């Protein structure tokens, strides 16, 4: 509603979810890419595309229901019904990528970065990386697209993981 | 004073500091630093000698209470009998449950609760308090309802903790 | 399928049959080595090769039908009929090796390791290892193959046990 | 070559063979200490000292033939012929030390450590770690091997002394 | 004395050797504590306290004779003769402390920590030594407390070593 609730949500989120929130709103933020959550929230406020429903959707996509009950005073079912009857701020591709990244540990992300170090810059990934940053780099090289998923599926199957491959195939079949 | 705070904070442990932070999470966002936590507590004005005594009594560190705060077990017991202003009984029950579980039990719990929580969040080398806060964020465990925790404790074959939970329910 | 049934199966299995369970799943997932039973079951859950039928087959292999009745709510006749009309999850060679190992005592592993001490060393066989462990070592030395069992047959003949040789002959002639 | 082979090799090996591989490759990559087998193999690939034949020869040294059958699609005859033709990477000294360490049980290494405590400055260890420590103190060298011979003679193990004598007769 | 030499020395050393060397160069760190061994080597080289002979001495005191034979083109006999000829950079007190700490077991050091925890407010012996020196309890001239504790923990060989040190230095 106001900037006070925006700041309250900003201060109530840890550093781990900051990256997820920034990756979620990359497509919507088409003017500039901000380095902090507060700048992104300010951009949405200035563009007028942020409201109670939009903030509820953003918080529900990251599974922080307690803040929704405390601040937004909505439960899971109400926000689900509201989102299902309203346009989505974030596309299904972004939430699918987030869900895929939510099911990996260090021993698997290390395997992925080691396997795919050849395709991208060897010195570009000197810094420690996560799955979201890896997908960001892949999109920066135009290797993965909302309609292109073969490379991602092959990479997932390379580390002997079928469940995520089945999820990707299901998403492909749904569309 | 100020030096007593430094003396207290220099003699604690990592797990003890984590338990203290979890207990103090009741009263915004918790900072990861203990010294910053004490500074913020003094700034907010909720910090008090009796409150700090109750806080250290809740973690079973009577030696520090007598060494620094110059008070015995009876003094903090009387202060609690007055009123438990600082912390709630729910957090005390959570800490008491969390202190009665070994590594195998938490391993079984995180294995059973892999459906609700993603693999990346839990990672490893985590204590029961971490699982508690993870469930609290998802609004699954709260003072109003404890059905999920009760069922999980039943599945891992520990009924005494279920009796503790039922005792807490009957007390309130 | 669910996590509860997996946990109940794990907690009701003794350490004696854990070695057999680990040996039986080597062919299913040979690209990785599982440390213990729980990690192996989680791995098969990841690969999508775990279901009611496969778990029933695995439990039938280790001869723990009471767990099938109490937990899986199935009898061994149903799983036997299902396996007769479905491909085997575990190769017949592995179950033959397990059956042969089950028919031996502690006084035979010493004789076998003494007979074939030239290939290996004292350090490798210093600890007490069952027939399954010795078979795994021989396979790692590429001396025993699913289509090549001459050396093992020779050793079994030399250790004054002919019934096991008859079983080996039956297996070879049947396949 | 490709990272698939390296990943499969890392996943297939266990801890003991990992330690043996680290020791065997220690001599060639003596400039930089590798933290894990993965980093060592990456450095070998980058430096150009790693090839299919070299990796097959290393696996043959570690005695994992099924890996050659499965991953590299080779049999031991081909790698033996390659060793006969192509000069080897790992020296004979390293494979001799590995052979000696293979036959020493859990008890004899403790006795050897107790015997050698006089020269060396200082829990449970493995013979590979002991020989590494001896090499660090410049007591065992590819040309100096009399100390190990005497210490194996005093422990009542004459076959290993015979192996050392045969190796010395080789050169 | 080239940068590649110090780079190789810093790279080839191990974590335990790195920590022991970091402790052993406490005296020359009057300006500031060196956060890393590379920084310490750079400071020593730029401050004139580092040389081929000095680096050989430090490598000798950490028992890395392979590096001396390979990197600095020296052997044990020559460096020992140089040590006899020239005064030592580091006093023998630090060397004695390092030798004592290299012999104590994990159980023994835990028992020592429990015994000494009353005086002060997992940790290696070197950490205990630096903590004690921070409290100004043990110094290269006074060793009664450490000797008495070592006697009390039924490890009398190190007590004999300390007595021999005390007799030799004075």
């Amino acid at each position: 509603m106001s900037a006070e609730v925006i700041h309250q949500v900003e201060e109530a989120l840890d550093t781990d979810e900051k990256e997820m929130l920034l990756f979620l709103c990359r497509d919507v933020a088409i003017d500039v890419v901000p380095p902090n959550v507060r700048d992104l929230l300010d951009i949405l406020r200035e563009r007028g595309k942020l409201s109670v429903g939009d903030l509820a959707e953003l918080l529900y996509r990251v599974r922080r229901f307690d803040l929704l009950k405390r601040i937004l005073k909505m439960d899971r079912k109400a926000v689900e019904t509201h989102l299902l009857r309203n346009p989505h701020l974030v596309s299904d591709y972004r939430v699918l990528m987030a869900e895929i990244g939510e099911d990996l540990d260090k021993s698997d992300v290390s395997s992925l970065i080691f396997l795919m170090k050849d395709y991208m810059g060897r010195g570009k990934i000197s810094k420690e990386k996560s799955f979201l940053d890896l997908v960001v780099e892949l999109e920066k090289l135009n290797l993965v697209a909302p309609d292109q998923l073969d490379l991602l599926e092959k990479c997932l199957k390379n580390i002997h993981r079928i469940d995520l491959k089945t999820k990707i195939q299901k998403y492909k079949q749904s569309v | 004073s100020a030096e007593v705070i430094h003396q207290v904070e220099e003699a604690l442990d990592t797990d003890e500091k984590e338990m203290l932070l979890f207990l103090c999470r009741d009263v915004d966002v918790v900072p990861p630093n203990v010294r910053d936590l004490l500074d913020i507590l003094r700034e907010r004005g909720k910090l008090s000698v009796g409150d700090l005594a109750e806080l250290l009594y809740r973690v079973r560190r009577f030696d520090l209470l007598k060494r620094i705060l110059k008070m015995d077990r009876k003094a903090v017991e009387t202060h609690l009998l007055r009123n438990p202003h600082l912390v709630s009984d729910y957090r005390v029950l959570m800490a008491e449950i969390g202190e009665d579980l070994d590594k195998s039990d938490v391993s079984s719990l995180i294995f059973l609760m892999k459906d609700y929580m993603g693999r990346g969040k839990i990672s490893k080398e985590k204590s029961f308090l971490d699982l508690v806060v993870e469930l609290e964020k998802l609004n699954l465990v709260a003072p109003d309802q404890l059905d999920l925790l009760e069922k999980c404790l039943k599945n891992i074959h520990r009924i005494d903790l279920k009796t503790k939970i039922q005792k807490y329910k009957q007390s309130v | 399928m669910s996590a509860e049934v997996i946990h109940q199966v794990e907690e009701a299995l003794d350490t004696d049959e854990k070695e057999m369970l680990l040996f039986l799943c080597r062919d299913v997932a040979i690209d990785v080595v599982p440390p213990n039973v729980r990690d192996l079951l989680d791995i098969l859950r990841e690969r999508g090769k775990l279901s009611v039928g496969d778990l029933a087959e695995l439990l039938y292999r280790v001869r723990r039908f009471d767990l099938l009745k109490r937990i899986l709510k199935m009898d061994r006749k149903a799983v036997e009929t299902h396996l007769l009309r479905n491909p085997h999850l575990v190769s017949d060679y592995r179950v033959l090796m397990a059956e042969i190992g089950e028919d031996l005592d502690k006084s035979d592993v010493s004789s076998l390791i003494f007979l074939m001490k030239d290939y290996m060393g004292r350090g490798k066989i210093s600890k007490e290892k069952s027939f399954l462990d010795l078979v795994v070592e021989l396979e790692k030395l590429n001396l025993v193959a699913p289509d090549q069992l001459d050396l093992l047959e020779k050793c079994l003949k030399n250790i004054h046990r002919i019934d096991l040789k008859t079983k080996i002959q039956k297996y070879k002639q049947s396949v | 070559m490709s990272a698939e082979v390296i990943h499969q090799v890392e996943e297939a090996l266990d801890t003991d063979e990992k330690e043996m591989l680290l020791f065997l490759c220690r001599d060639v990559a003596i400039d930089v200490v590798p933290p894990n087998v993965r980093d060592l193999l990456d450095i070998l690939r980058e430096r150009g000292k790693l090839s299919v034949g070299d990796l097959a020869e290393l696996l043959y040294r570690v005695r994992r033939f099924d890996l050659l059958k499965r991953i590299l699609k080779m049999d031991r005859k081909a790698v033996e012929t390659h060793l006969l033709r192509n000069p080897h990477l790992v020296s004979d000294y390293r494979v001799l030390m590995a052979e000696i360490g293979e036959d020493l049980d859990k008890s004899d290494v403790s006795s050897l450590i107790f015997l050698m405590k006089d020269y060396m400055g200082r829990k449970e260890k493995s013979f590979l770690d002991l020989v590494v420590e001896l090499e660090k103190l410049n007591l065992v060298a590819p040309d100096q091997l009399d100390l190990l011979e005497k210490c194996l003679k005093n422990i009542h193990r004459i076959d290993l002394k015979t192996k050392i004598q045969k190796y010395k007769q080789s050169v | 004395m080239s940068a590649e030499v110090i780079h190789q020395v810093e790279e080839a050393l191990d974590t335990d050797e790195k920590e022991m060397l970091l402790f052993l160069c406490r005296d020359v760190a009057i300006d500031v504590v060196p956060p890393n061994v590379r920084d310490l080597l750079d400071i020593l080289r730029e401050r004139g306290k580092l040389s081929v002979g000095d680096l050989a001495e430090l490598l000798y005191r950490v028992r890395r004779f392979d590096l001396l034979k390979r990197i600095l083109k020296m052997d044990r006999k020559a460096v020992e003769t140089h040590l006899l000829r020239n005064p030592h950079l580091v006093s023998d007190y630090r060397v004695l402390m390092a030798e004592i700490g290299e012999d104590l077991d994990k159980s023994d050091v835990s028992s020592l920590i429990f015994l000494m925890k009353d005086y002060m407010g997992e940790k290696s012996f070197l950490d205990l030594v630096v903590e004690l020196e921070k409290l100004n309890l043990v110094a290269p001239d006074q060793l009664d407390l450490l000797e008495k504790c070592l006697k009390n923990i039924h490890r009398i060989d190190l007590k004999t070593k300390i007595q021999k040190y005390k007799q030799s230095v004075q």
Partner: protein, 182 residues
Amino acid sequence: MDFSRNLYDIGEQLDSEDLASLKFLSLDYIPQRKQEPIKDALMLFQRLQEKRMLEESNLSFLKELLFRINRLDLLITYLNTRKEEMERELQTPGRAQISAYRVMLYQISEEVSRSELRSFKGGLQEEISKCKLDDDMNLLDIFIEMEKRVILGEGKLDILKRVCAQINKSLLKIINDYEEFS
């Protein structure tokens, strides 16, 4: 540092079995989480010092622990206290810091041999699976496991009596004496 030296000397004389007995008897004041990493007497003494139950001027709990495990020589060699004084102090009501239930359980545990342990495990095959109570665990671990499932406790002892009846009857006499204490 004489007190710390005395405590270290006392702790030097305790082997694995006695340390396990001390850990089991101190379950009323040390939770499982703080007890799992304990592997030597020094950690247990530190834990006791944390709760201010053992210190320079308070050795009553240490004396009680050392007397309940029949290490009488350590009582007089270091703590300078004889058996008669300990018995007189303990017989006074309200002065014992260990409940009689734990002492009875420990004493029952002490009077069972390996064959009797196997008989006990076989008799506990009905309510509890044999796998959870295999040969690895000892009697104290079985008692802890029974306590976990609230089949055995201060107010419930029927299962214990029924199981012990198959092995011996003097154990039933000990249980009856404990009941007479209540």
